[PDB]
Amino acid sequence: VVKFTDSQIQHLMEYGDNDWSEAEFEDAAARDKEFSSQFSKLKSANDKGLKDVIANPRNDLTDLENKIREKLAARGFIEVHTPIFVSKSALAKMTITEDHPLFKQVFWIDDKRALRPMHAMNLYKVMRELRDHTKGPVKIFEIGSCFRKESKSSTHLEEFTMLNLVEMGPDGDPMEHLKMYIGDIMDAVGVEYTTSREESDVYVETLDVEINGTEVASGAVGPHKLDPAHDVHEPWAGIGFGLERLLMLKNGKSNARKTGKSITYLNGYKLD
Amino acid sequence: VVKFTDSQIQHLMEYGDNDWSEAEFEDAAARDKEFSSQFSKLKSANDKGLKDVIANPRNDLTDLENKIREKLAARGFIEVHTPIFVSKSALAKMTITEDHPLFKQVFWIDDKRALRPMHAMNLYKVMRELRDHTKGPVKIFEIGSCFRKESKSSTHLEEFTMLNLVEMGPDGDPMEHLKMYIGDIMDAVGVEYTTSREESDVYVETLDVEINGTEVASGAVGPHKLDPAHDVHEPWAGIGFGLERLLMLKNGKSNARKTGKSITYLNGYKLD
């Protein structure tokens, strides 16, 4: 009728990924006996995991990116690296001004610049100017950090790695093209997935993708209301994936902070 | 007698990397003509390269990073991805206070966090805590962007991709280990280089790296002076390279803004 306290679960959740939610005990002394035994059990397995990294070096995040890069490369996508700084006017083009709920989540650098909370601003600009240099499909994507202000015990990261791809002039059907790129992304992760195409009024069609019943991304297809503000006048398709959450699901990790850019974790193992 | 306008020089440096500094003409009529013809020629050459990226997608920055990654991995290095936010305490351990000349160019987020202007802060903590998990050599490196406030003359970038490697607990001669790693990076970019080794102290030895008599990097081997502030008490080696300036020298670009993270350049070609 008693189990772990609120701060000894926190140590077990830092060195291990298993759910100690309902592991009951006889008394307050029996709960302390297994905590110390399990706390050292995870601590030493966490130690041997990093010893394996030192013997067989690798970076889980880089390895995943390079597989996504080479799958999208077979489809004819150009990888671009856009700046992290974005303008106040670019954010205003995406309806993101003071009345928008995402406005208070924005890290401002000066009165005119901020850290990008998404890739749409820079990809809208790049994909349109590429249209000036070709009459065929524009296929670009980017992998890099975006930033948002968050609650401090919230599960969401303040800096997270986003993968956003977009095709601006599909030679085939734009929705079928996006579904095929989804499958390319999922095979790089190694998981199977569920897709559910659903209607919407502000896009032409929406594609909700989910892994094990958990929605992880939603793609758009067709002309959007914000297109004329970016001088875009053709049907397009695109979707964004959070890469830390994908690693967390593939590796059964406790939370997204264990797989992202961090000074306390490395390939999922704790450093201190 | 007469030579190019300053406005004409800027136009030709935005579409080409050729030096039109010392070309002279008869008078204004002949100067205004070669400009219009060179400008039109550079544009279609710039256009022809963008069409080649569309026909054969690539990204010179990713292509170089991965080549560096796989050469360092053969040496037993571990790629780590650390956060971009850093505390003002972590900077203070690096003597980056109001006293320091780097303080003025620091991008602050709030009063206790800033955007990293170098990789030393985060690499200090990851290399030290990995000592708690092995007795042999500690080898890590990061490829990521750091931020510094620059003036509007702006021939240094505000966001630049830094490559910083660290070898701790040498396992051999640390200086020749560093000499070798430099050759690995230089073979990845594909340039002939020279070295210059001077004696900082009885403890540390510095090594300067120049490409075409232009210094591109500075490294130190031994017990660094800021080690006690990070609980580090053993010799190590490290050096950082600007990935943009390296790409600028190999491809002969006119300035590093054509090779970095940009919305106007894509593999060195202008988009607008």
Numbering used by the authors:
A (entry chain B), B (entry chain A): 2 to 273
Kindly provide excerpts from the paper associated with this entry.
Site-specific incorporation of non-canonical amino acids into proteins in response to specified (e.g., UAG) codons has been achieved by pairs of an engineered aminoacyl-tRNA synthetase (aaRS) and tRNA, including the pairs of pyrrolysyl-tRNA synthetase (PylRS) and tRNAPyl (CUA). The PylSc-type PylRS from the methanogenic archaeon ISO4-G1 (ISO4-G1 PylRS) is highly similar to MaPylRS with 64% sequence identity, while ISO4-G1 PylRS and MaPylRS both share around 38% sequence identity with M. mazei PylRSc. The following residues Asn60-Asp273 constitute the catalytic domain, with the characteristic topology of the class-II aaRSs: an extended six-strand, anti-parallel β-sheet (β3, β4, β5, β6, β7, β8) surrounded by α-helices.
The asymmetric unit contains ten molecules of PylRS (five PylRS dimers, A/B, C/G, D/F, E/H, J/I). The structures of the ordering loop (residues Ile97-Gln106) and the motif-2 loop (residues Lys150-Glu159) are quite similar in the ten PylRS molecules, while the β5-β6 hairpin (residues Thr195-Ile212) adopts open and closed conformations. Tyr204, at the tip of the β5-β6 hairpin in ISO4-G1 PylRS molecules A, C, E, F, and J, is located far from the amino acid binding pocket (the open conformation), while in ISO4-G1 PylRS molecules B, D, G, H, and I, Tyr204 is located inside the amino acid binding pocket (the closed conformation). Interestingly, the ISO4-G1 PylRS structure revealed that the His225 residue (corresponding to His227 in MaPylRS) undergoes drastic conformational changes in accordance with the location of the Tyr204 residue (corresponding to Tyr206 in MaPylRS) in the β5-β6 hairpin. On the one hand, when Tyr204 is far from the amino acid binding pocket (the open conformation), a π–π stacking interaction is observed between the imidazole ring of His225 and the indole ring of Trp237. On the other hand, when Tyr204 is located inside the amino acid binding pocket (the closed conformation), the imidazole ring of His225 shifts and is stabilized by a π–π stacking interaction with the aromatic ring of Tyr204. In ISO4-G1 PylRS, the Met128 side-chain protrudes into the amino acid binding pocket, which would reduce the pocket size as compared with that of MmPylRSc. Based on the crystal structure of ISO4-G1 PylRS, the β5–β6 hairpin may exist in a dynamic open-closed equilibrium, and the location and conformational change of the His225 residue appear to be important for the catalytic activity.
